[PDB]
Amino acid sequence: MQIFVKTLTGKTITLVVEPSDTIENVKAKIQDKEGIPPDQQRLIFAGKQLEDGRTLSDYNIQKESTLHLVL
Ligand SMILES: [Zn+2]
Ligand SMILES: [Zn+2]
Ligand SMILES: [Zn+2]
Ligand SMILES: [Zn+2]
Ligand SMILES: [Zn+2]
Ligand SMILES: [Zn+2]
């Protein structure tokens, strides 16, 4: 399972994840790829604001889904 995270510039980050991964897990992976602090990251999927403690599968994030980093 992989997902795509688009940064505020439109750069695509591809991440290996599992259904149970938390959004906090995802933020850590983004920090490692791009150096963006987790406290500065806000993620959306299908217009939903994603909370650190919930999982990909809680939000129906699927293989090949795209998330956005937002302000
Ligand atoms: Zn797979
Ligand atoms: Zn596992
Ligand atoms: Zn994981
Ligand atoms: Zn794991
Ligand atoms: Zn900070
Ligand atoms: Zn989009």
From Swiss-Prot:
Site feature Interacts with activating enzyme, where: 54
Cross-link type Glycyl lysine isopeptide (Lys-Gly) (interchain with G-Cter in ubiquitin), residue numbers: 6, 11, 27, 29, 33, 48, 63
PTM section of the record: Phosphorylated at Ser-65 by PINK1 during mitophagy. Phosphorylated ubiquitin specifically binds and activates parkin (PRKN), triggering mitophagy. Phosphorylation does not affect E1-mediated E2 charging of ubiquitin but affects discharging of E2 enzymes to form polyubiquitin chains. It also affects deubiquitination by deubiquitinase enzymes such as USP30. Mono-ADP-ribosylated at the C-terminus by PARP9, a component of the PPAR9-DTX3L complex. ADP-ribosylation requires processing by E1 and E2 enzymes and prevents ubiquitin conjugation to substrates such as histones.
Highest taxon above the source species: Eukaryota
Site (Essential for function): 68
Annotated consequence of substituting residue 9 to D: Impairs ubiquitination by CRL2(KLHDC3) E3 ligase complex
Subcellular localization: Cytoplasm; Nucleus; Mitochondrion outer membrane
Membrane topology of the entry: Peripheral membrane protein
Effect of residue 63 to R: Abolishes HLTF-mediated polyubiquitination of PCNA
Effect of residue 65 to D: Phosphomimetic mutant that binds and activates PRKN
Modified residues ((Microbial infection) ADP-ribosylthreonine): 66
Modified residues (Phosphoserine): 65
Consequence recorded when altering residue 7 to D: Impairs ubiquitination by CRL2(KLHDC3) E3 ligase complex
Purpose of the protein: Exists either covalently attached to another protein, or free (unanchored). When covalently bound, it is conjugated to target proteins via an isopeptide bond either as a monomer (monoubiquitin), a polymer linked via different Lys residues of the ubiquitin (polyubiquitin chains) or a linear polymer linked via the initiator Met of the ubiquitin (linear polyubiquitin chains).
Protein name, UniProt field: Ubiquitin
Organism: Homo sapiens
